[PDB]
Amino acid sequence: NLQEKQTDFGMRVFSQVAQNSKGSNLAFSPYGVATILAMAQLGAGGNTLKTLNAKLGFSLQERGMARQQRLLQRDISSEEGVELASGVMVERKMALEKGFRRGLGKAFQASPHQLDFSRPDQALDIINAWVSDHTAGTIPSFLSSGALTDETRMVLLNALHFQGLWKVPFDPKMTEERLFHCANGSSVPVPMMRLTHRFKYGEFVTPDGVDYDVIEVPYEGESLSMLLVSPFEPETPVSSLSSELTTQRLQQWRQEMRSVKRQLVLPRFTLDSEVELKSILIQMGLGDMFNLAKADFTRITTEQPLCVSKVLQKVKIEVNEEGTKASAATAAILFSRMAVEEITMNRPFLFLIHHKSTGAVLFMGQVNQP
Fold it and tell me: I want to staple 135 with a disulfide (CB 3.0 to 4.6 A). Which of 1, 38, 52, 327 is the partner?
């Protein structure tokens, strides 16, 4: 039940982006964003806490919730091939309340890491090496120069790493080099993997009459799979499949999908994405945690004012005949001016990497083809 609320919030962030830009971010971790906001929630008080319980839809400070969170993370990370790590990087001169530290350790195994932010280049190197060590070196420069300065006080940090082999791998002899015409007048070859096999599959319709199908492509080990969601009309906005991205509706897909012989076609692709989500979060009602004059993080410290400045995520995804490798690093920075130029593409062919036992959606994004 906690995971359902966390997953739903994380997919609501994905959907909120789709409502604006337009199209969606290429690749995203709902798990990473919900986790970072939960860590910030453990430090909130008054109206900031109130708003956070209301908009996140879960309340990590309530009795028993930290214990649940710990169990959920333990389950997800118990899979061979998936690792989770969290941390609170904190200005060394800034005392943290024991209660906040304790809650972070209990819920998220997030230990403190002292940094001297008066040497922001060294702090940046330490944070980046931490993220690199928890992403198999696949995200080695999480923060770029200037993200931290001498005014930064805290970075809340999470890293998720996944490697899985397909239960039924693709045969590379069946991958066809398909030429796609591009805007610039060039053609590019894309390797299109093709596998015919029994896969769980179903057709569905949204409350607004949009037809789509879902196919599940399992990884070895019975607990993780990739769901591919595809509208029958390819020029459907991503936002049209938004009503669908909930835990309840995913459970409905599972109830109905049956194994049938299908030819599955999936490109061999890689994605690199970087997003900063302050403006999206403010749109979703979380304005108070970003307002220095209004924010209440007195559970973090009562010794100086604090608010969140940026919420940053970087995701890397590699899909091929053998399996999938994916990493996400997410952070909330308290005092920072960093900026990220955002990239949305408007294609509604979605993937979700889903952990069955918990309902967690580890990664989601667009199936990359021109």
Answer: 327
